[PDB]
C-alpha cells in the first residue's frame, strides 16, 4: 500500500484548510513575546489537559509549543 | 493577559478539537495498523515522501505526520 | 552532495546520547511522573530551564523532552 | 520530586546550549541553503539513520537542524 501518505496528506489538508487560519489570528492576538510565550504555553496546557489527556492532545501541545516558539521568532516584540 | 488570558482559552480549546479528532479518526487508526514494525522507519520514510510528493506543504500536515509517527513508536514501543 | 551532513549529525547525535541519556532514564525514573501529574513536573522543569534565558537549543531541548516524558508515562504510568 | 526536576532542568539548559554552542552544528547549517530545504532534511534523515541506529541524541540533533533551517528561511 502507498496510499497511506496521499491519506494523510488529505487529513492533514483538512486539518490545515480549517484550523490554521484560525490559529494564525488566535496567535496574532495573543501578541506573545520570548518573555512570555511560555506561560501562555502553560496555561493553554493547563486547561487543554483539563478535559484529559489523550495522545491526540498531547501531539497537539508538542506540535503547538514549535509552532509558538517559530511565531514568537518571526512576529516577536510585541508586533 | 500575562499568565491569564482569553486567547489562551480559544487556544487551548482549539487545540483539544485537533487532538480529539486524531484519536477519533479511524482511517488514520487503521492505518497505524495496517503497518508492520518488520521495518518502521521505512515505513514512515516512504509515508513522508508520499505525502509530500504534490509538493505541498502546510502545518495540518506536520500535525498529521507527527500523529501517525508518534503512534507508530507506541506501537514499536508496545507492540513487537 | 549531502551525505558529510547526515553522518555528522549521527555522529553529534550519539554523543549526546551516550553521556546524557543514561542521566535521563534515570532522573525520569526516580521522578516517577503519573499519567496524571506528568504536566506539573514539565512545567516546573520548563521554568527552570527558561529562567537563564531562552535560546532555541533550550526550547528544542525542551520539545524533545515533552515527547519523551510523554512516551516514559504511557509505558510507566501506574500511579 | 523537585529533587530530580531540577537536575532534569540543569540537563536541559547543558544540552540546549551545547547544541547553539556547537560550531560543527552551526557551520553545517550555514552550509546549507534555502534553495530546496525539506529535501535536504529527508535526505539527511535517512542518511543519518542509513546505519540503522535509532536514539534520543540523534533525534535531538536532527530537530534542532531542522528547526534552525526553518529559522533561517524564516529569516
Ligand atoms: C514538529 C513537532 C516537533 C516535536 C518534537 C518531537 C521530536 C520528534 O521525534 C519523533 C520521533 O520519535 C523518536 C522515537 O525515538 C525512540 C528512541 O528509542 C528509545 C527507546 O526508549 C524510549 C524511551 O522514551
Redesign the pocket.
Given at each position: 500500500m502507498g496510499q497511506v501518505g496521499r491519506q494523510l496528506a488529505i487529513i492533514g489538508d483538512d486539518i490545515n484548510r480549517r484550523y490554521d487560519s484560525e490559529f494564525q489570528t488566535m496567535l496574532q492576538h495573543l501578541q506573545p513575546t520570548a518573555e512570555n510565550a511560555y506561560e501562555y504555553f502553560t496555561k493553554i496546557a493547563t486547561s487543554l489537559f483539563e478535559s484529559g489527556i489523550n495522545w491526540g492532545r498531547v501531539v497537539a501541545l508538542?506540535?503547538f509549543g514549535?509552532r509558538l516558539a517559530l511565531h514568537v521568532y518571526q512576529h516577536g516584540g510585541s508586533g | 493577559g500575562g499568565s491569564g488570558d482569553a486567547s489562551t482559552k480559544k487556544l487551548s480549546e482549539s487545540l483539544k478539537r485537533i487532538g480529539d479528532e486524531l484519536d477519533s479518526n479511524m482511517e488514520l487508526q487503521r492505518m497505524i495498523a495496517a503497518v508492520d514494525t518488520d521495518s518502521p522507519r521505512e515505513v514512515f520514510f516512504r509515508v513522508a515522501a508520499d505525502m509530500f510528493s504534490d509538493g505541498n506543504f502546510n502545518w495540518g500536515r506536520?500535525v498529521a505526520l507527527?500523529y501517525f509517527?508518534?503512534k507508530l513508536?507506541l506501537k514499536a514501543?508496545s507492540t513487537k
Open positions: 508538542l506540535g514549535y | 506536520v507527527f509517527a508518534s513508536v514501543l
